[PDB]
Design a protein around this ligand. Sequence first.
Ligand code: NA
Ligand code: NA
Ligand code: NA
Lengths: 90, 90
Amino acid sequence: SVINLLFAAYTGDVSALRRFALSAMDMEQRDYDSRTALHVAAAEGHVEVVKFLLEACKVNPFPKDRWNNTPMDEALHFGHHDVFKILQEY
Amino acid sequence: SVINLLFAAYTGDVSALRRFALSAMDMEQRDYDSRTALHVAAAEGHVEVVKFLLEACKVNPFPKDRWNNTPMDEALHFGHHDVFKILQEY
Ligand code: NA
Ligand code: NA
Ligand code: NA
């Protein structure tokens, strides 16, 4: 569910993301702005969420939102340098 | 539901927005990116949706999303001169 997934990313709720992924939720679904859970996590600087999505869920690391920004662009824009460097590995 | 609201604005579904507003839904509700129905409608150039939100629902014409953009900024970004003109009179 878009509401549940992207809000869980927004609040850093790794436990909820895990329940969703285990239940086979598509962790790459997008909202009306073409945003992903990874975009939102990276914009908030949620390191553990970003690592979970990338490593355990294998999500696309470079989705493009409606402004053509990637999660890495968002991390740099909002000052989350640790998240930025995590995404750099990809 | 903020996501139902914003998806209706995304697809230009004025009939759905009317049903929501009539049932006392808060039409100024924000998502995890601080986006409003008015932002999304303006980005998509949905003139009738924009005028319905402004004129019938009396929403704030200048909400600011996560990137500090207003619906007017989105109208401009996506080239919607017609939507820009509507917002300019506010
Ligand atoms: Na952090
Ligand atoms: Na800065
Ligand atoms: Na916030």
